[PDB]
Design a protein around this ligand. Structure first.
Ligand SMILES: CCCCCCCCCCCCCCCCCC(=O)OC[C@H](COP(=O)([O-])OCC(O)COP(=O)([O-])OC[C@@H](COC(=O)CCCCCCCCCCCCCCCCC)OC(=O)CCCCCCCCCCCCCCCCC)OC(=O)CCCCCCCCCCCCCCCCC
Ligand SMILES: CCCCCCCCCCCCCCCCCC(=O)OC[C@H](COP(=O)(O)OCCN)OC(=O)CCCCCCCCCCCCCCCCC
Ligand SMILES: CCCCCCCCCCCCCCCCCC(=O)OC[C@H](COP(=O)(O)OCCN)OC(=O)CCCCCCCCCCCCCCCCC
Ligand code: SF4
Ligand code: SF4
Ligand code: SF4
Ligand code: SF4
Ligand code: SF4
Ligand SMILES: [K+]
Ligand SMILES: [Zn+2]
Lengths: 378, 95, 176, 145, 207, 96, 114, 129, 108, 48, 116
């Protein structure tokens, strides 16, 4: 059979018997940087910015997974207002990821116009990131204990004005794709996954929900205040690219439904745990009180010690189930930090999902899995 | 927002929707770039009495794992009760 | 709760079946897509006229590191090395010794702007508001060596951007 | 200790004493532990340190312009818990976490004191004692330091 | 309740302790230790010969149904005779629970491949091989996955240096990218951060 | 202030200058040497000594939360002044 | 008692005779368990939970009400789990996990922190 | 009583050829196994409880451009931790490194008495409190 | 500005290196650079490409793309804003405006 | 300024034709904005 | 029981040597195809001597388990060359063409630096 090393951050080694794909062999590592080994020379706070850079489309949801894991080993609890902020920006991050996933999935198969309409919406959401943290993408805003700073005055009004119009933007996206017969032909009955193969291959997220499996960690193993909001979990019927495209488009609508509740049920209070052996004190009280200066000095040089133990903590990240197997030895620096990227198992099933399909279908199947190689390789 | 009436009619008809009510460009409905100073609150631990740290020390209440078995009539059990079935949404069951 | 996305049963009456025959033969839903692109042709584009117009930012923006002074002209930094300890990229290098008048002052303060991840931890750790990230984001160079800042380059930045740096810190220090 | 302060008053401040070119004194940081007093009297044999005053105004020093020069004086830097007594030659040069520790031996005399040599980016920053019950315990002479 | 302390869930601690005993009674041949953490996670520690028996039981039994392999990784501890600790993290959609299964090995003793039980283990085991050097027997396709071709050593071992042993560069004479011993313009600076005062007396070890 | 070496190269506030025969000076040919002209040691020497009427005075650097950690300075010695360890300002007791 | 058009799970076909299929499988499981030693805990537990699921099938002629009793999702899922238990039982005979522990771990194999 | 068949290997456990370390850093290095000495500026003893293994120091020079501290030794920062001395020597032997072992130095018990401060006829009577 | 969104390697005038260059990726980068028809310029975007950034001390990262290919412009930031990369591109335009190829050939 | 324009186009700067002895009629540059105006032009404040 | 361990492939050195020789034959017959596919500038004789040198280094191993691993890595390194997963840079890294010779005698090491 003819063999092609398509290469370049993905190198695909495929053997093709004419038009059919007889085997797909993904060669990865072109973006391996040794993240997990570097985290072992950092304090728990110094390793926080690494997680913004794993799945760089869903930055603030990787912080939350790491923050949930550390807060679990510390045995502390973030304050209620911080949790509501961490859900508000978890759903805003979920709009950022699904626009990128859907529109770059459609741009790789020809439809270039929806990319430009929706990247004007991403630009506006990048201002919400920049107004709270000061950075458009790698905010490092979610931390063990809560969030770094409180929302600036007037941001929630600007989130409301944006959310008020977004549902119309999705509708225009669906006027170009959902019923277009060319789009359906590229995505219907392509990459069919059985509900039993998906579980045994390690799939999670819309890779499960597209095949009819009723599973969403936000509802079954909730974290923060996801059990105080109302939303629906889209479910597929045929387990193909088209059903999975409808699940992400419908999850963008259920995020607007969650955001509308976070804006109305946002409580008052503080935004980081009121324990100054974990979260740094205020600068005003760091410059007047002796204990607050001692604790500021030690938290930013040694860091807080985490009791010995190991934990596996996971969230429903935009691309699936994202978790970390964090191991502590009782010091300020983690011993081992394994990262479970949902796209690592999804891309390992590309060979299975591309059996009996054309070469041009492998493009669609890679798109439907929503692969970002920052997390796959780490 | 400066589109003439005719072009507004043409754009609305082409898309089938009322675009002027949900413009994707921001004009004046946005917050002022200068805002009054805030006064943020303080947490529950900002007290002058009845506030000893040994009564709210989360890290010191963590314990090492408990050993249930170690090599150095009973009714069957499962890790947890079986998960309850999900219910169709009355909001919009079918898309 | 959950909802089905693609579980509809299409009707098989003659009118419905003829509706899908007209759609197949007369390309109705394809021409519905041409109309949407036509509407965008008559919408005002979102492009701004850079470099004469700039994208909005906020007082919390994190740009070019810089070293500040007190209103008297004395340097704020007292060589505590907290920023050097917290920098996740190890982009900061410091050396200090007693000054001629006995003050605790640095003799080296370098930031490698190619190791730096522009994270802001250096300005959170500083107890005296000495090292800050300013609002300047247009400082690209033509060689790699121009991005290795030393204490002279960082003090020049502070004197150069103090008017804007002070106003930003005035606008945000109540949230810190 | 706790993690916050409920102290709402003004703080005490004390004037510094000059006791030679080796030990720098910033006595507002003293916590009146009396380790330096007990060391200078029992280990060193110089009864020049003491407590003057009473109550919250109690101070540690010489009470006169006297220099605590001895072949063992530098050791009060290590036993002082706080930054009240710090090495003057070492002042402001390095922080403890950035130093690499090399466990070596002394050669300034024939006793063979066990020392720790602190380096930092390829430069020797200071010399500290290293416990050895049979040679030097946890003391070194000023010349070795 | 205490606003700053994570609440305890004693119900889930009693249910996971019952199931841990339940598993150890059914596989005495393999289970060496079962422990439940203070934040309600269950760990089954097994002899390395029981990787296939124990995992198959947990996937297929009617009261376990751990049908999803959340993750599989290794941890390196140089002070043990068997350095490498292999960790399986599993999920159960039927009972909405998670469980952790751990075994051990060393540089030279192989472990049985889990691909027959979980097709998800195919790539995870290559990653453990590539980064730790643990050989998995009967693997359909075992080879480096993350490191560069021709890479020597296993970078996640605790004794492998952070910056490696060689670095790449373009040489104009030979018109290709070459590998050379690593010299750093600025050496990585090592900070000794640990405080000399005990932090947690609950975890103190016997002297 | 900035004073130039015999070879014409300026001296920084830390005292740095390349000797005459140091090859490293070639980096400045067709270029310049970045030197900050505002020597902090000179600027803080121009500030007047503040007269106070108490044994102990407090300094926070000015601006409240925008200054430096608040420290208390003892003014019992008339031979010298009280100097702030953070900002370098000086304080003196009024004739007692 | 109307038959369902789809199970909702891709690759899982509807079964027209759920009651007959389950009785066969459960009986087959109980017959395979007879070859396992009497005292082995796997036999005692699996018989305990197989019989009560077999008694629920033989006392509930309605499929929808049977699923509520079994609590295993679709009746096709309960059939699939029976086939997995049957395969597991056939494998426990060859493994014999009821024997004593093969080997003890080294002295400090499970100590943490080191 | 394992089911798998076992073989006999009566040889020294040596892995120098499969760890991938260049021979330059196996034969010319000298590991040092020791218990870190207590930092003399503090009274804490919590950093003197585990055995460490470090390698021998090598050249550090100055970067011509900035003045940073350059190095060519890939083992300059490598530190390993061990629960006991026997486990540290085991790791060095199988990796082929030459090592020196220094016995743990534990402070000897001391005889303390607050009443000795006020002795009637002995030399331990202090003169100040 | 005239800067097309996407161009093939053989129809392109500038290479923008945006991300971390690993040791497994470096040979592919040099190959693409050698096949670019001249004149050709390289823009280094971000801390990773400039000097390695957050992964500088990693075993699998090339410390700066400028030791694999020549670089004309360095754009700092992690990541640089989209308005900071645009400023760098317009700074490459002015650099090309200062070229004097013909005025140096005429004086040979 | 022109507040009828949509946010982002409501403030612009027409650069000088000469700055620090450099001819900037054609060679404009975004770093020619001094810090005091750099804050107003980027909408970090409403006060010129 | 301490010396009783599980094997990888070979139960004794005699079976291990069989795998070593089969691997050597595989490498010996591939050099002409490698020197041709990658358009190397070395000769086939130089290629076949490098294989000989690599095998010679590990000729003092007496542990069958260790020998099995060396063969496993050799077969992995071989599959990369046959299938052209490597590139010309990777193949030529066995030769060190851009590294200046480093002296082996005491005096030369004394003149240049401090390393032994
Ligand atoms: C054939 C299509 C008809 C062409 C005529 C276009 C026209 O008159 O549109 C008017 C009017 C303006 O369009 P719009 O959608 O409302 O948006 C502009 C704003 O209303 C109002 O926007 P504005 O306030 O910014 O308008 C100011 C604008 C002045 O507005 C115009 O220039 C529009 C007239 C252009 C003709 O000033 C300019 O920028 C002048 C630049 C002129 C460049 C284009 C020159 C085209 C001439 C033909 C090429 C010859 C070579 O559109 C119509 O009514 C079309 C109906 C007739 C068809
Ligand atoms: C032909 C080229 C266009 C020439 C200009 C046509 C006349 C322009 C005009 O003013 O009327 C256009 C008309 C808009 O009227 P309409 O949108 O229906 O009313 C909204 C009131 N706010 O639009 C129309 O409805 C007319 C077409 C029907
Ligand atoms: C003609 C318009 C009237 C009509 O179509 O019949 C309507 C009639 C009522 O509708 P309904 O109840 O759904 O019946 C269909 C159930 N089999 O539905 C009928 O039952 C009518 C008879 C059904 C069979 C007619 C099949 C029509 C398609 C034949 C091909 C027509 C090709 C025309 C040329 C196409 C190119 C323009
Ligand atoms: S922004 Fe972050 S990475 Fe950059 S110098 Fe400051 S602390 Fe270091
Ligand atoms: S934290 Fe601030 S005062 Fe301390 S060394 Fe850094 S810049 Fe100077
Ligand atoms: S040893 Fe230090 S803290 Fe103790 S009394 Fe002497 S100066 Fe004060
Ligand atoms: S380091 Fe210690 S002695 Fe120095 S000021 Fe802080 S608490 Fe006081
Ligand atoms: S955003 Fe930062 S971490 Fe990510 S590739 Fe760019 S420079 Fe590297
Ligand atoms: K001291
Ligand atoms: Zn001051």
């Amino acid at each position: 059979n003819l063999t092609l090393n398509f290469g370049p951050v993905l190198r695909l080694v495929m053997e093709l018997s004419g038009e059919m794909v007889r085997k797909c062999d993904p060669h990865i590592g072109l973006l391996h940087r040794g993240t997990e080994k570097l985290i072992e020379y950092k304090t728990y706070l110094q390793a926080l910015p690494y997680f913004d850079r794993l799945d760089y489309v869903s930055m603030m949801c990787n912080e939350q997974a790491y923050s949930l894991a550390v807060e679990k080993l510390l045995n502390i609890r973030p304050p209620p207002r911080a949790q509501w902020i961490r859900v508000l920006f978890g759903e805003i991050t979920r709009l950022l990821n699904h626009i990128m996933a859907v529109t770059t999935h459609a741009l790789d198969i020809g439809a270039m116009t929806p990319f430009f309409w929706m990247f004007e919406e991403r630009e506006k959401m990048f201002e919400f990131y920049e107004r709270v943290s000061g950075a458009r993408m790698h905010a490092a805003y979610v931390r063990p204990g809560g969030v770094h700073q409180d929302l600036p005055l007037g941001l929630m009004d600007d989130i409301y004005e944006f959310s008020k119009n977004f549902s119309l933007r999705i509708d225009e996206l669906e006027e170009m794709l959902t019923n277009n017969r060319i789009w359906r032909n590229r995505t219907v009955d392509i990459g069919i996954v059985t509900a039993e193969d998906a579980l045994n291959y390690g799939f999670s997220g819309v890779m499960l929900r597209g095949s009819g499996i009723q599973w969403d960690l936000r509802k079954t193993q909730p974290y923060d205040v996801y059990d105080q909001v109302e939303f629906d979990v889209p479910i597929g019927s045929r387990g193909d690219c088209y059903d999975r495209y409808l699940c992400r488009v419908e999850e963008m609508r259920q995020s607007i439904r969650i955001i509308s509740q976070c804006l109305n049920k946002m409580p008052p209070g503080e935004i980081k745990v009121d324990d100054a052996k974990v979260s740094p004190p205020k600068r005003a009280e760091m410059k007047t009180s002796m204990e607050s200066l001692i604790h500021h000095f030690k938290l930013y040089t040694e860091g807080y010690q985490v009791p010995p133990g190991a934990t596996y903590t996971a969230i429903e990240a935009p691309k699936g189930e994202f978790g970390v197997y964090l191991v502590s030895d009782g010091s300020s620096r983690p011993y081992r930090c394994k990262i479970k990227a949902p796209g690592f198992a999804h891309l390992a099933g590309l060979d299975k999902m591309s059996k009996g399909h054309m070469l041009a279908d492998v493009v669609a199947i890679i798109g439907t899995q929503d692969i970002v190689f920052g997390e796959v390789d780490r | 927002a400066s589109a003439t009436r005719f072009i507004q009619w043409l754009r609305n008809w082409a898309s089938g929707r009322d675009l002027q009510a949900k413009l994707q460009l921001r004009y004046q409905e946005i917050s002022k770039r200068t805002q009054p100073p805030p006064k943020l609150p303080v947490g529950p631990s900002h007290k002058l009495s009845n506030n000893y740290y040994c009564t709210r020390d989360g890290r010191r209440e963590a314990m090492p794992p408990s050993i249930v078995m170690s090599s150095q009539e009973k009714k069957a059990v499962s890790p947890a009760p079986p998960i309850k079935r999900w219910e169709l949404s009355q909001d919009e069951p079918y898309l | 709760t959950y909802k089905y996305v693609n579980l509809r049963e299409p009707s098989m009456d003659m009118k419905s079946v003829t509706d899908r025959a007209a759609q197949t033969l007369l390309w109705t839903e394809l021409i519905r897509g041409l109309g949407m692109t036509l509407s965008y042709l008559f919408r005002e584009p979102a492009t701004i006229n850079y470099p004469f117009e700039k994208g909005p930012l906020s007082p919390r923006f994190r740009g070019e590191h810089a070293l500040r002074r007190y209103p008297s002209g004395e340097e704020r930094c007292i060589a505590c090395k907290l920023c050097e300890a917290v920098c996740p990229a190890q982009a900061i290098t410091i050396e200090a010794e007693p000054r001629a008048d006995g003050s605790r002052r640095t003799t080296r303060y370098d930031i490698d702007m190619t190791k730096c991840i522009y994270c802001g931890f250096c300005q959170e750790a500083c107890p005296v508001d000495a090292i800050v990230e300013g609002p300047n984001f247009e400082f690209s160079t033509e060689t790699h060596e121009e991005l290795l800042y030393n204490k002279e380059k960082l003090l020049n930045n502070g004197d150069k951007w103090e008017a804007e740096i002070a106003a930003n810190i005035q606008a945000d220090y109540l949230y810190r | 200790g706790s993690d916050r302060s409920r102290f709402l008053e003004g703080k005490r401040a004390v004037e510094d004493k000059n006791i030679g070119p080796l030990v720098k004194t910033i006595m507002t940081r003293c916590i009146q532990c009396t380790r330096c007093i007990r060391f200078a009297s029992e280990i060193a044999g110089v009864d020049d340190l003491g407590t003057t005053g009473r109550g919250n105004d109690m101070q540690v020093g010489t009470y006169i312009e006297k220099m605590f020069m001895s072949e063992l004086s530098g050791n009060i830097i290590d036993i002082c818990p706080v930054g009240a007594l710090t090495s003057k030659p070492y002042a402001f040069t390095a922080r403890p976490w950035e130093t690499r520790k090399t466990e070596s031996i002394d050669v300034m005399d024939a006793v063979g004191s066990n020392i720790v040599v602190s380096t930092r980016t390829g430069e020797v920053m200071r010399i500290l004692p290293r416990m050895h019950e049979d040679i030097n315990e946890e003391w070194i002479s000023d010349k070795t330091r | 309740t205490r606003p700053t302390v994570r609440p305890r869930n004693d119900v889930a601690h009693k249910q996971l302790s019952a199931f841990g005993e339940y598993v150890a009674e059914i596989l005495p041949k393999y289970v060496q230790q079962v422990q439940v953490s203070c934040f309600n996670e269950l760990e089954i520690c097994i002899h390395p010969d029981g990787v296939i028996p124990v995992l198959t039981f947990l996937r297929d039994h009617s009261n376990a149904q751990f049908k999803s392999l959340a993750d599989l990784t290794a941890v390196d501890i140089p002070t043990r005779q068997n350095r490498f600790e292999i960790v399986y993290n599993l999920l159960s959609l039927r009972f909405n629970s998670r469980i952790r299964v751990k075994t051990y090995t060393d540089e030279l003793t192989p472990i049985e491949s889990s691909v027959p039980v979980y097709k998800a283990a195919n790539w995870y085991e290559r990653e453990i091989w590539d980064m730790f050097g643990v050989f998995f027997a009967n693997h359909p396709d075992l080879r480096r996955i993350l490191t560069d071709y021709g890479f020597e050593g296993h970078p996640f071992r605790k004794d492998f240096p952070l910056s490696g042993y060689v670095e790449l560069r373009y040489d104009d004479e030979v018109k290709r990218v070459v590998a050379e011993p690593v010299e750093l313009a600025q050496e990585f600076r090592k900070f000794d951060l640990n405080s000399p005062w005990e932090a947690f007396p609950a975890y103190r070890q016997p002297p | 202030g900035v004073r130039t070496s015999p070879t014409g190269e300026k001296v920084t506030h830390t005292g740095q200058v390349y000797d005459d025969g140091d090859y490293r000076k070639v980096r400045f040919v067709g270029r310049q040497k970045e030197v900050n002209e505002n020597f902090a040691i000179d600027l803080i020497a121009e500030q007047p000594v503040s007269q106070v009427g108490s044994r102990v005075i407090s300094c926070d650097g000015g601006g409240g939360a925008l200054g430096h950690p608040r420290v208390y300075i003892n003014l019992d010695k008339e031979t010298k002044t009280g100097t702030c360890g953070y900002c370098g300002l000086q304080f003196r007791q009024q004739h007692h | 008692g109307l038959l369902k058009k789809t199970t909702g799970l891709v690759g899982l076909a509807v079964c027209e005779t759920p009651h007959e299929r389950l009785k066969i499988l459960y009986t087959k499981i109980l017959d395979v368990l007879g070859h396992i030693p009497k005292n082995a805990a796997y036999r005692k537990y699996t018989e305990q939970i197989t019989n009560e699921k077999l008694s629920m099938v033989k006392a509930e002629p309605d499929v929808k009400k049977l699923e509520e009793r079994l609590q295993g999702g679709q009746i096709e899922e309960v059939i699939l789990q029976a086939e997995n238990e049957l395969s597991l039982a056939r494998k426990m005979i060859q493994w014999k996990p009821w024997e004593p522990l093969v080997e003890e771990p080294p002295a400090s194999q499970w100590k943490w922190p080191i | 009583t394992r089911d798998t068949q076992l073989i006999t290997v009566d040889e020294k456990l040596d892995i120098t050829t499969i760890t991938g370390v260049p021979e330059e850093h196996i034969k010319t290095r000298k590991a040092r196994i020791f218990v870190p000495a207590r930092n003399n500026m503090q009274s804490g003893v919590n950093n003197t409880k585990k055995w460490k293994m470090e390698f021998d120091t090598r050249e550090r020079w100055e970067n011509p451009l900035m003045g940073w501290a350059s190095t060519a030794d890939p083992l300059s920062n490598l530190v390993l931790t061990f629960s006991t001395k026997e486990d540290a020597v085991a790791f060095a032997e199988k990796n082929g490194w030459s090592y020196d072992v220094e016995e743990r130095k534990v402070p000897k018990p001391k005889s303390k008495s607050y009443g000795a401060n006020f002795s009637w006829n002995k030399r331990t009577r202090v003169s100040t409190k | 500005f005239g800067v097309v969104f996407r161009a093939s390697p053989r129809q392109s005038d500038v290479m923008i290196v945006a991300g971390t260059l690993t040791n497994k990726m470096a040979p592919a980068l040099r190959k693409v650079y050698d096949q670019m028809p001249e004149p050709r310029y390289v823009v280094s975007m971000g801390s990773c490409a400039n000097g390695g950034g957050y992964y500088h001390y990693s075993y699998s990262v090339v410390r700066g793309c400028d030791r694999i290919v020549p670089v004309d412009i360095y754009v700092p930031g992690c990541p640089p804003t989209a308005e900071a990369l645009l400023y760098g591109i317009l700074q490459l335009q002015k650099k090309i405006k200062r070229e004097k190829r013909l005025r140096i050939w005429y004086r040979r | 300024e022109d507040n009828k324009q949509f946010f982002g186009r409501h403030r612009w700067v027409i650069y000088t034709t000469e700055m620090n002895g450099k001819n900037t009629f054609w060679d404009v540059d975004g770093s020619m904005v001094p810090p005091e105006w750099h804050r107003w032009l980027h909408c970090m404040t409403d006060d010129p | 029981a301490s010396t009783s361990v599980k094997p990888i492939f070979s139960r004794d050195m005699n079976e291990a040597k069989r795998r070593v020789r089969e691997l050597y034959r595989a490498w010996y017959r591939e050099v002409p195809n490698t020197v041709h596919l990658f358009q190397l500038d070395i000769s086939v004789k130089q290629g076949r001597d490098k294989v000989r040198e690599m095998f010679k280094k590990n000729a003092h191993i007496t542990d069958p388990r260790v020998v099995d691993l060396l063969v496993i890595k050799g077969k992995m390194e071989l599959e990369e060359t046959i299938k052209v997963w490597k590139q010309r840079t990777h193949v030529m890294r066995f030769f060190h063409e851009t590294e200046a010779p480093r002296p082996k005698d005491f005096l030369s090491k004394f003149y240049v630096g401090h390393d032994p």
